[PDB]
Design a protein around this ligand. Structure first.
Ligand SMILES: [K+]
Ligand SMILES: [K+]
Ligand SMILES: [K+]
Ligand SMILES: [K+]
Ligand SMILES: [K+]
Ligand SMILES: [K+]
Ligand SMILES: [K+]
Ligand SMILES: [K+]
Ligand SMILES: [K+]
Ligand SMILES: [K+]
Ligand SMILES: [K+]
Ligand SMILES: [K+]
Ligand SMILES: [Mg+2]
Ligand SMILES: [Mg+2]
Ligand SMILES: [Mg+2]
Ligand SMILES: [Mg+2]
Ligand SMILES: [Mg+2]
Ligand SMILES: [Mg+2]
Ligand SMILES: [Mg+2]
Ligand SMILES: [Mg+2]
Ligand SMILES: [Mg+2]
Ligand SMILES: [Mg+2]
Ligand SMILES: [Mg+2]
Ligand SMILES: [Mg+2]
Ligand SMILES: [Mg+2]
Ligand SMILES: [Mg+2]
Ligand SMILES: [Mg+2]
Ligand SMILES: [Mg+2]
Ligand SMILES: [Mg+2]
Ligand SMILES: [Mg+2]
Ligand SMILES: [Mg+2]
Ligand SMILES: [Mg+2]
Ligand SMILES: [Mg+2]
Ligand SMILES: [Mg+2]
Ligand SMILES: [Mg+2]
Ligand SMILES: [Mg+2]
Ligand SMILES: [Mg+2]
Ligand SMILES: [Mg+2]
Ligand SMILES: [Mg+2]
Ligand SMILES: [Mg+2]
Ligand SMILES: [Mg+2]
Ligand SMILES: [Mg+2]
Ligand SMILES: [Mg+2]
Ligand SMILES: [Mg+2]
Ligand SMILES: [Mg+2]
Ligand SMILES: [Mg+2]
Ligand SMILES: [Mg+2]
Ligand SMILES: [Mg+2]
Lengths: 88, 101, 73, 119
RNA sequence: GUGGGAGAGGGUGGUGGAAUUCCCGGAGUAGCGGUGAAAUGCGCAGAUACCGGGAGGAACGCCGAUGGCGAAGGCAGCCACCUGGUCCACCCGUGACGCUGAGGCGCGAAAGCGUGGGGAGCAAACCGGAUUAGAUACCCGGGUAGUCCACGCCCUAAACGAUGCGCGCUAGGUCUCUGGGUCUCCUGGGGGCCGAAGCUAACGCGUUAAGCGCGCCGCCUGGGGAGUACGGCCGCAAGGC
């Protein structure tokens, strides 16, 4: 799973400022954590299709946000991608 | 780290000596995996509801240990190796759900 | 009609999650080692559900029965 | 000859025949009977009457070994299942106690097409 | 975000008891089985019925519900691990980041296909017994593929609520699952029943709409010929679109 600390860590590591919990960046980070943790799970259990539905949803939820960010502040965008190491 | 309960039913015909060797191996293993005995309840033997391993009784052991999840299955598999160990029932500890209280 | 006294009423405080109290668990099994209905256990769905779980645990341990022989007749 | 005086009486009822097996306190058979063991050959074996005779027949065959009292075990739900009980009671043999112990699975094998459907 | 919750949601490993079958031992003897009645069949190389031991496969009694979970298919012993969804409370953070969704991609009961394994019980085909005017059937005795596992295909269905998805609006009553609260009851999410307004050809629907509205997709246009022919795409094939 993902413990409070782990969770809390990344949040802080990404909050746009102290107290920032629900910013686009925080979200994308958090999401990336899940997507990755889940992605590894699937490499093992390739048959757990149900969980894979979830994967699909997150990957999408992420696209949505990133797309939003990049349309509002193309900079913070490139920044966030760079940090999170996303895109292609 | 998570809190579990290693239930163990042993051969009801072990002499004070035999009971001890098996009971220590139990202690031995618990360590090799990452357990930490918080408490034990050697309730001893009781009359089984059905014959287990051809005996109408079993010697019961209980522990409220704490260990690393990714090992719980492995440890349990180990305890089972013994022939005097006829039951290994490990359970994630829970908050007592009272009722009619 | 499931009359008589309910198993819950006829009892005090207990931990539905304690799969080792044979004295009390044993009360929720019928003459046969079958798990009694809500009509009889006098429990709430949520409770009844937890019970079944612990009872099944007690059986595997040997503490409780899986089935008993019907007597009389 | 062997003298037992007390043992078990197993009644195996079914919708096609009744069959009584009397054994020692360890389950080893001493004598047995059935619808066919008596005259009956076709469907008259599942008849409660058949049961009665079959049961009575076993009781006598048992008396011979000194048998005096017995524990009954009932398996099956055929007709004349309750008749074999009744019979044994009035058979000189003292019926210490009845007990239904019909096997039932906790769902193992797919039944024959003839025995399929639930709820 | 934080704190709580219920659940047969999924995947992996392990494990428990009941029952069937087979094998070993005991005891025991003449039938058992099966049907409307029978017969085939099995049994003195000793069956059936009974007790003890063992092997193996498949499925999980009671709990169990009118219940729960899932997007659908679908999901039920128990334990651990890995993992998806979801509801509630607090109003804490971002600040319209939303809805729908041609094509695409993925999932997709059963049967079926390939390779390997397994095989208790059941069972297309098939081999027999009966029934019948006949009986390529129903009933009975057998029994192969298959049913089960791994990996890869197939992509269909009365895949059904025969009801696409989201949002707002329009009386209530009653049972129920799950959560919060000052806990008769109030408030939220889900499952049912009856019903205001209204709708409907009618049956019925009726805050879980088939009502009143807006957004987007899919689809229809008399019956037969025909889900056929042709073409294309897909599949090892069967065959699918
Ligand atoms: K014969
Ligand atoms: K249901
Ligand atoms: K969860
Ligand atoms: K084949
Ligand atoms: K399957
Ligand atoms: K497939
Ligand atoms: K409450
Ligand atoms: K009307
Ligand atoms: K109607
Ligand atoms: K074609
Ligand atoms: K082709
Ligand atoms: K096809
Ligand atoms: Mg008969
Ligand atoms: Mg939470
Ligand atoms: Mg589940
Ligand atoms: Mg068995
Ligand atoms: Mg034998
Ligand atoms: Mg012959
Ligand atoms: Mg002979
Ligand atoms: Mg032979
Ligand atoms: Mg047999
Ligand atoms: Mg046996
Ligand atoms: Mg075998
Ligand atoms: Mg639903
Ligand atoms: Mg989770
Ligand atoms: Mg706020
Ligand atoms: Mg602001
Ligand atoms: Mg969409
Ligand atoms: Mg399929
Ligand atoms: Mg299949
Ligand atoms: Mg195959
Ligand atoms: Mg094969
Ligand atoms: Mg068959
Ligand atoms: Mg003919
Ligand atoms: Mg047949
Ligand atoms: Mg339907
Ligand atoms: Mg209502
Ligand atoms: Mg409601
Ligand atoms: Mg409600
Ligand atoms: Mg429902
Ligand atoms: Mg009206
Ligand atoms: Mg209505
Ligand atoms: Mg609406
Ligand atoms: Mg069309
Ligand atoms: Mg036409
Ligand atoms: Mg025309
Ligand atoms: Mg047509
Ligand atoms: Mg077609």
């Amino acid at each position: 799973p993902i413990t409070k600390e782990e969770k809390q860590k990344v949040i802080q590591e990404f909050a746009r400022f102290p107290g920032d919990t629900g910013s686009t960046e925080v979200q994308v980070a958090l999401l990336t954590l899940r997507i990755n943790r889940l992605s590894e799970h699937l490499k093992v259990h390739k048959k757990d299709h149900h969980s894979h539905r979830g994967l699909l949803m997150m990957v999408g939820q992420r696209r949505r946000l990133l797309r939003y960010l990049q349309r509002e502040d193309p900079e913070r965008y490139r920044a966030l991608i760079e940090k999170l190491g996303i895109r292609g | 780290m998570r809190r579990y309960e290693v239930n163990i039913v042993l051969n009801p015909n072990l002499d004070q000596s035999q009971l001890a060797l098996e009971k220590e191996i139990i202690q031995r293993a618990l360590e090799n995996y990452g357990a930490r005995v918080e408490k034990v309840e050697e309730l001893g033997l009781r009359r089984l509801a059905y014959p287990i391993a051809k005996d109408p009784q079993g010697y019961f052991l209980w522990y409220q240990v704490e260990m690393p999840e990714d090992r719980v299955n492995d440890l349990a598999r180990e305890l089972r190796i013994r022939d005097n160990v006829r039951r290994v029932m490990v359970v994630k500890s829970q908050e007592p759900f009272l009722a009619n209280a | 009609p499931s009359r008589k006294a309910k198993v819950k009423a006829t009892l005090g405080e207990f931990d539905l999650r304690d799969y080792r109290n044979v004295e009390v668990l044993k009360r929720f099994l019928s003459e046969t080692g079958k798990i009694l209905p809500r009509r009889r256990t006098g429990l709430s769905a949520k409770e009844q559900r937890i019970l079944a779980k612990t009872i099944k645990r007690a059986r595997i341990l040997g503490l409780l029965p899986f089935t008993e022989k019907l007597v009389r007749k | 000859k062997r003298q037992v005086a007390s043992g078990r009486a197993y009644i195996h009822a079914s919708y096609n025949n009744t069959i009584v097996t009397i054994t020692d306190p360890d389950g080893n058979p001493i004598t047995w009977s059935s619808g066919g063991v008596i005259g009956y050959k076709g469907s008259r074996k599942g008849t409660p009457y058949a049961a009665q005779l079959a049961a009575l027949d076993a009781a006598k065959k048992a008396m011979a070994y000194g048998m005096q009292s017995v524990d009954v075990i009932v398996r099956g739900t055929g007709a004349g299942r309750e008749q074999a009980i009744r019979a044994l009671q009035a058979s000189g043999l003292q019926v210490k106690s009845i007990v239904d112990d019909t096997p039932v699975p906790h769902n193992g094998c797919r039944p024959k097409k003839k025995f399929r459907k639930a709820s």
